[PDB]
């Protein structure tokens, strides 16, 4: 029985929560707090360990962008620090390929990154790889066919509907077909061989539309919209369904968790988080 | 019968309050609201008028750092707009020399200013003067011997214990002895020929320590700490005593007002604001 872990986030200030949802029995566990609160971070799992990457601690005292990599061991309920990234990355995207963590984009102060770096757990080392073609913060990242897709975001001037693809073996990036909608701060994930982009902000409105990319036909197609518009949502896939967690709708920090069934093409509300928040990191282990 | 005015501030969002404390009889007056809520602003009095400078507005549409200068006339209980600064300055510091308002540092989005500009009420215009040696936001400013001192703050990557001194006749800055403690968002004022730096944030916790600078010995000395830790506190001097108003202690937005008596070197709590808040502008007239 795998859990959906949610780390950090923002409500009045950046948060330290680590909580895990058990979709089979509907319960929430309260696990050990992050050592430093952050929102705009990303989460992933490698080898049964949970990783919290990047983000920014926004507190009433001021803001601090994060370069931290932290490791959570579910067996010990303990966070441990790992080697930091080369730069701080707020509103980062992350993907895992072959046991390596890729950190893509994000901001540091005025800097909107196009750089990308790769973490190797066996050596506790980060190394830069080829940079993206576009600077992107608030970018969604998905892994499919052992390639890394970077989708949407904000380049420092415009919000983006573009997307691009990284080839680890060749170490190079290529543009792919652009989405139908401009989306910064969407949730992006992979389900049944397609890339989904749910929600985000198009420059005027938080979005409830969802579109998905078929790599062979190279086209983006809308599916059923979510019930609640949302930006800076968390997202993950569990037992063949997409779960979206929290987010900001322009007025409210959401506690709603919606679940997409690709068979029936419908969303249902499955649970609430213990409190509303945006900018969580999310992963399944 | 001079009153302590407190303008604007922050409690879950930027505030529009203008209120005035009478230390002789212990009452609070509710005056006309700022036309635009702001936190992180500074206040000062020139020629019996109250000025509110800079700061940051939270609105449904987003956040806006302020270049505004607004003037409150206590006779008419009315705010009027004056000429705006050259740039927005959130977490600004302000000092007055010879009836001229100096706006120092502060931030505009991710930009951390070292520029300084000077307002002349008689012409209603701003002019830039020589920039500081260090970028500083959350800077405390104090005027002593017709010199302007900028104390502490955040340069965009580090919170500062450094301080520097501005010479209006020569139009230049020189670094002075650094404080014992790193502080951004401290209360800085002049009393009995010493510069005091109270509270603030040292990068780890909110501070309750207070230190004072003697310009002839060039050394900072700790005095009695405040009862409450606080950052983004308001501060002023009234009848030989320092008053600190509000601020954030790490958990709550304080309504406490403490009063420092230098004769006895003790702090006592003298009143509470009508509601807890941080980031106020404070002046006496």
């Amino acid at each position: 029985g795998r859990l959906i872990y949610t780390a950090g986030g923002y409500f009045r200030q950046s948060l330290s929560y680590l909580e895990a949802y058990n979709p089979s029995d509907g319960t929430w566990l309260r696990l050990a707090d992050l050592q430093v609160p952050r929102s705009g971070l990303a989460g992933c799992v490698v080898g049964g360990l949970l990783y919290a990457v990047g983000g920014r601690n926004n507190s009433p005292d001021g803001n601090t962008d994060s370069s931290a990599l932290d490791c959570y061991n579910p067996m010990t309920n303990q966070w441990s620090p790992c080697a930091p990234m080369s730069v701080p990355r707020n509103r980062i995207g992350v993907g895992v390929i072959d046991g390596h963590i890729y950190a893509v984009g994000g901001s540091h102060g005025c800097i909107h990154h196009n750089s990308v770096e790769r973490y190797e757990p066996e050596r506790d080392e980060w190394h830069l790889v080829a940079p993206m073609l576009t600077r992107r913060i608030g970018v969604g990242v998905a892994v499919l066919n052992r390639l890394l897709y970077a989708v949407g975001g904000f380049d420092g001037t415009n919000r983006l509907n573009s997307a691009e693809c990284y080839y680890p073996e060749r170490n190079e990036w290529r543009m792919i077909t652009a989405m139908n909608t401009i989306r910064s701060g969407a949730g992006v994930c992979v389900l049944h061989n397609c890339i989904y982009a749910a929600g985000g902000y198009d420059g005027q409105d938080q979005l409830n539309s969802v579109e998905r990319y078929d790599v062979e036909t190279e086209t983006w197609t809308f599916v059923a919209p979510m019930k609640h518009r949302r930006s800076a949502l968390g997202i993950t896939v569990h037992q063949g369904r997409i779960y979206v967690l929290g987010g900001y709708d322009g007025h409210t920090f959401l506690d709603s968790v919606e679940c997409y069934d690709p068979d029936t093409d419908t969303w249902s509300e499955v649970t609430r988080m213990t409190s509303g928040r945006s900018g969580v990191g999310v992963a399944v282990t | 019968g001079r009153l302590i005015y407190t303008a604007g501030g922050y409690f879950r969002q930027s505030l529009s309050y203008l209120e005035a404390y009478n230390p002789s009889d212990g009452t609070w007056l509710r005056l006309a609201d700022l036309q635009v809520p702001r936190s992180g602003l500074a206040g000062c009095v020139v020629g019996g008028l109250l000025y509110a400078v800079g700061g940051r507005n939270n609105s449904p549409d987003g956040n806006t750092d302020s270049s505004a200068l607004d003037c409150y006339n206590p006779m008419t209980n009315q705010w009027s707009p004056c000429a705006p600064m050259s740039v927005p300055r959130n977490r600004i510091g302000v000092g007055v020399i010879d009836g001229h308002i100096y706006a120092v540092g502060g931030s505009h989005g991710c930009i951390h200013h070292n520029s300084v500009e000077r307002y002349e009420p008689e012409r209603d215009e701003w002019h830039l003067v020589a920039p500081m040696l260090t970028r500083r936001i959350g800077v405390g400013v104090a005027v002593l011997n017709r010199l302007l001192y900028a104390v502490g703050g955040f340069d965009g990557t580090n919170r500062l214990n450094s301080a520097e001194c501005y010479y209006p006749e020569r139009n230049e800055w020189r670094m002075i002895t650094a404080m014992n403690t790193i502080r951004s968002g401290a209360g800085v004022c002049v009393l009995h020929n010493c510069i005091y730096a109270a509270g603030g944030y040292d990068g780890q916790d909110q501070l309750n320590s207070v230190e004072r600078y003697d310009v002839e010995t060039e050394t900072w000395t700790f005095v009695a700490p405040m009862k409450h830790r606080r950052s983004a506190l308001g501060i002023t001097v009234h009848q030989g005593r320092i008053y600190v108003l509000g601020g954030y202690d790490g958990h709550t937005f304080l309504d406490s007002v403490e009063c420092y008596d230098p004769d006895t070197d003790t702090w006592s709590e003298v009143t509470r604001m009508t509601s807890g808040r941080s980031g106020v502008g404070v002046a006496v007239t």
């Binding site: 923002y10 929102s39 705009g40 926004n58 509103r91 608030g138 904000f154 910064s184 701060g185 985000g200 902000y201 938080q206 930006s231 800076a232 900001y248 322009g250 920090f253 945006s278 900018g279 | 969002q13 939270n58 956040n63």
Partner: peptide, 5 residues
């Protein structure tokens, strides 16, 4: 996009 102040 994130609701942060």
């Amino acid at each position: 996009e994130t609701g942060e102040l």
